[PDB]
Design an enzyme around this catalytic site. Structure first.
Site, PDB file in Angstrom:
ATOM      1  N   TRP A  94      36.418  91.302 -85.666  1.00 27.95           N
ATOM      2  CA  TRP A  94      36.012  92.002 -84.454  1.00 27.95           C
ATOM      3  C   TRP A  94      36.008  93.511 -84.690  1.00 27.95           C
ATOM      4  CZ3 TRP A  94      40.027  88.741 -85.164  1.00 27.95           C
ATOM      5  CH2 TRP A  94      41.347  89.157 -84.870  1.00 27.95           C
ATOM      6  N   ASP A  95      36.817  94.273 -83.959  1.00 25.47           N
ATOM      7  CA  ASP A  95      36.768  95.743 -84.026  1.00 25.47           C
ATOM      8  C   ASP A  95      36.812  96.243 -85.464  1.00 25.47           C
ATOM      9  OD1 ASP A  95      37.382  95.054 -81.370  1.00 25.47           O
ATOM     10  OD2 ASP A  95      38.667  96.801 -81.099  1.00 25.47           O
ATOM     11  N   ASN A 106      21.895  96.603 -97.483  1.00 25.81           N
ATOM     12  CA  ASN A 106      21.853  96.080 -96.107  1.00 25.81           C
ATOM     13  C   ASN A 106      22.134  94.576 -96.004  1.00 25.81           C
ATOM     14  OD1 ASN A 106      20.925  98.699 -95.360  1.00 25.81           O
ATOM     15  ND2 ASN A 106      18.793  98.076 -95.636  1.00 25.81           N
ATOM     16  N   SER A 156      43.087  98.775 -83.719  1.00 23.87           N
ATOM     17  CA  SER A 156      41.994  99.639 -84.182  1.00 23.87           C
ATOM     18  C   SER A 156      42.332 101.115 -84.388  1.00 23.87           C
ATOM     19  CB  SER A 156      40.791  99.511 -83.235  1.00 23.87           C
ATOM     20  OG  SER A 156      40.397  98.162 -83.193  1.00 23.87           O
ATOM     21  N   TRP A 194      47.615 100.551 -59.972  1.00 25.90           N
ATOM     22  CA  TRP A 194      48.011 100.472 -61.363  1.00 25.90           C
ATOM     23  C   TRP A 194      46.995 101.082 -62.340  1.00 25.90           C
ATOM     24  CZ3 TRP A 194      53.058  99.340 -61.857  1.00 25.90           C
ATOM     25  CH2 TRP A 194      53.677  98.688 -60.773  1.00 25.90           C
ATOM     26  N   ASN A 207      44.994 103.583 -64.439  1.00 27.90           N
ATOM     27  CA  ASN A 207      45.075 104.974 -64.905  1.00 27.90           C
ATOM     28  C   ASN A 207      44.732 105.136 -66.371  1.00 27.90           C
ATOM     29  OD1 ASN A 207      47.507 103.868 -65.740  1.00 27.90           O
ATOM     30  ND2 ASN A 207      48.631 105.818 -65.467  1.00 27.90           N
ATOM     31  N   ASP A 253      41.961 100.313 -65.709  1.00 31.53           N
ATOM     32  CA  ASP A 253      43.141 100.402 -66.541  1.00 31.53           C
ATOM     33  C   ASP A 253      42.817 100.145 -68.013  1.00 31.53           C
ATOM     34  OD1 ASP A 253      45.743 101.342 -66.071  1.00 31.53           O
ATOM     35  OD2 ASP A 253      46.595  99.348 -65.705  1.00 31.53           O
ATOM     36  N   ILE A 304      39.840 101.540 -71.036  1.00 37.61           N
ATOM     37  CA  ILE A 304      38.653 102.151 -71.644  1.00 37.61           C
ATOM     38  C   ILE A 304      38.970 102.254 -73.143  1.00 37.61           C
ATOM     39  CG2 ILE A 304      37.257 104.284 -71.827  1.00 37.61           C
ATOM     40  CD1 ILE A 304      38.038 104.858 -68.860  1.00 37.61           C
ATOM     41  N   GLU A 305      38.184 101.580 -73.984  1.00 40.59           N
ATOM     42  CA  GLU A 305      38.584 101.330 -75.375  1.00 40.59           C
ATOM     43  C   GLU A 305      37.684 101.995 -76.415  1.00 40.59           C
ATOM     44  OE1 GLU A 305      38.598  96.890 -75.374  1.00 40.59           O
ATOM     45  OE2 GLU A 305      40.770  97.072 -75.164  1.00 40.59           O
ATOM     46  N   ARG A 331      35.424  96.795 -70.458  1.00 41.60           N
ATOM     47  CA  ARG A 331      35.113  95.554 -69.765  1.00 41.60           C
ATOM     48  C   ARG A 331      35.307  95.885 -68.274  1.00 41.60           C
ATOM     49  NH1 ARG A 331      34.396  91.187 -73.101  1.00 41.60           N
ATOM     50  NH2 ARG A 331      35.263  91.208 -75.218  1.00 41.60           N
TER      51      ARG A 331
HETATM   52 CA   LIG Z   1      48.195 101.593 -65.364  1.00 36.91          CA
END
Ligand SMILES: [Ca+2]
Ligand SMILES: [Cl-]
Length: 533
Positions: A96-97, A142, A165, A312, A314, A346, A348-349, A367
């Site tokens: 994955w990541d 490639n 990650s 919750w 933030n 809650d 953001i990646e 997500r």
């Molecule tokens: Ca939080």
């Protein structure tokens, strides 16, 4: 007989609401609103921005929708048949990541003795098996089949210490400076995350085209949060009632022109702008017209799950400057968040900063089902069967001043159901040499844990080009590569990888059995999908 305060009375009247129709309860709630204009934690992903991102996803606009992929061409990564860090035995991992070893100033994929190097999270599907591995191929080759695996960076291990990650760049002597997330799960299985760094030295056997991990030095913790700008583990433990996210991960290395080095990472706000019930009353968090905001305020307060999530939420994208000890860095300066989503999300990646011309572009994956507004993200699942997006911002300055792209911050939006072979996530933009107005978008394709079916593993997606416009907008281009192509070169374009929204087309976005199959229990997968126009 409760009476409205001055400022909020103006809001109510401007909104066309009859003040005499308000209850005492509503009046008492309205009088708690704080109309402060001063941003406490960078540029915000507001409640209205989140609604706009969801609406844009539902519209499936050619400008933003992730391109359809030819499902029949997608294969599991051959290099993922490899020794597993948690068993010592060869198993079929998924991947994955992932991130390339890249130049810290320009983001260009580094050429290491004729090779391109990528570090990625891999593990056995449905096992808690989170460790990082080194993959390599000839530079500019490639062919997805040609990638080889040098094995887990840190050798054999267990779920007690995990690696999530980060990013990587070369040192002058040809070692890799790796920035990664060290996760300790020994405290009641919590994912206690820290930003870490290590120096990785490679051995090349030229006559076998074989790279091995020779030495790993200077492995240590760089940053765990300060408590003011970014939430610490101890703060999280103290406030948690069981539904609060913890984040200190996904460090992205970037150097400014003067060669100062920074890490941009995923975290949560600290006491500078802490989560809590109070966030519901901060007008700045809403981000629409006064009338829209008033409606949102009452939506949040009247719906227990939205209200809970709001208290919750933030998420932050943070930045720290490192000292000049390149192989053994310590933190030199902690800044306020570049972006934050108090009250709104809650999670953001994978933040990714790329310099194009004289501007800094900051992108992140999210997500939307981690957002507070259940009605908004549930609507995205109903339209597309998934809720993933890439968001983006631009600034003249690295450490502050970011402006959302495409008004709301939307850049990419989900286009197929989450349980299809061609679902994607973990978007990561890579610059393209000789094209200063475009980025190559890499991702993984197929969700983890066999959700698309046994034997359908998370694997590297075909990459596609994104056009960056000087007027702070973006547009998806009809240019696509082989799976796992991190470098846009003269032979990268492969139109056979492109998919279509047609059930029985050989290049369908759906594998046989997927068109119409249930998602989210009883939603008909694909039912509301539309051609991208
Ligand atoms: Ca939080
Ligand atoms: Cl480790």
């Amino acid at each position: 007989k409760a009476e409205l305060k001055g400022q909020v009375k103006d809001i109510v009247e401007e909104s066309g609401v009859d003040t005499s129709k308000l209850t005492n309860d509503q009046i008492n709630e309205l009088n708690k609103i704080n109309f402060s204009k001063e941003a406490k934690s960078g540029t915000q992903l507001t409640y209205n921005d989140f609604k706009k991102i969801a609406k844009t996803l539902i519209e499936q606009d050619a400008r933003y929708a992730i391109p359809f992929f030819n499902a029949s061409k997608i294969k599991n990564m051959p290099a993922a048949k490899t020794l597993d860090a948690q068993s010592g035995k060869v198993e079929d991992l998924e991947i994955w990541d992932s991130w390339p070893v890249q130049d810290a100033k320009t983001g260009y994929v580094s050429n290491w003795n004729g090779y391109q190097l990528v570090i990625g999270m891999m593990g056995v599907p449905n096992v808690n098996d989170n460790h990082i591995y080194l993959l390599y191929n000839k530079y500019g080759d490639n062919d997805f089949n040609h990638w080889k695996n040098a094995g887990p960076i840190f050798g054999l291990g267990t779920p007690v210490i995990q690696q999530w990650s980060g990013s990587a760049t070369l040192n002058k002597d040809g070692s890799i400076q790796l920035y990664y997330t060290k996760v300790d799960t020994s405290d009641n299985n919590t994912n206690h995350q820290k930003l870490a760094s290590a120096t990785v030295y490679l051995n090349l056997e030229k006559d076998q085209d074989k790279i091995s991990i020779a030495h790993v030095d200077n492995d240590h913790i760089v940053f765990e949060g300060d408590g003011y700008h970014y939430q610490t583990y101890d703060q999280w433990k103290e406030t948690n009632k069981g539904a609060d996210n913890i984040a200190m991960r996904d460090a992205h290395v970037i150097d400014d022109d003067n060669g100062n080095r920074y890490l941009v990472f995923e975290a949560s706000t600290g006491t500078e702008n802490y989560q809590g019930d109070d966030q519901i009353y901060q007008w700045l968090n809403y981000g629409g017209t006064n009338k829209d905001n008033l409606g949102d305020f009452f939506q949040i307060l009247s719906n227990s799950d939205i209200k809970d999530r709001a208290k919750w939420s933030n998420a932050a994208i943070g930045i720290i400057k490192l000292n000049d000890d390149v192989k053994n860095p310590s933190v030199a300066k902690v800044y306020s968040p570049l972006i934050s989503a108090p009250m709104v999300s809650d999670e953001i990646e994978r933040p990714d900063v790329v310099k194009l011309g004289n501007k800094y572009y900051l992108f992140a994956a999210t997500r939307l089902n981690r957002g507070s507004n259940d009605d908004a993200w549930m609507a995205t699942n109903k339209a597309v069967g998934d809720n993933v997006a890439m968001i983006g911002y631009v600034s003249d300055n690295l450490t502050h001043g970011y402006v959302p792209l495409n008004e709301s911050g939307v850049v990419l939006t989900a286009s197929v159901p989450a349980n299809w072979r061609t679902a994607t996530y973990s978007y990561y933009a890579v610059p393209v040499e000789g094209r200063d107005d475009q980025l190559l978008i890499t991702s993984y394709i197929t969700n983890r844990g066999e959700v698309a079916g046994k034997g359908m593993h998370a694997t590297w997606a075909p990459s596609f080009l994104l056009q960056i416009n000087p007027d702070n907008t973006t547009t998806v281009l009809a240019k696509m590569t082989n799976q796992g192509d991190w470098i846009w070169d003269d032979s990268s374009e492969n139109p056979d990888m492109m998919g279509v929204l047609e059930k029985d087309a050989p290049n369908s976005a759906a594998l046989p059995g997927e068109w119409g199959k249930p998602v989210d229990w009883d939603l008909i997968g694909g039912y509301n999908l539309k051609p991208h126009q």
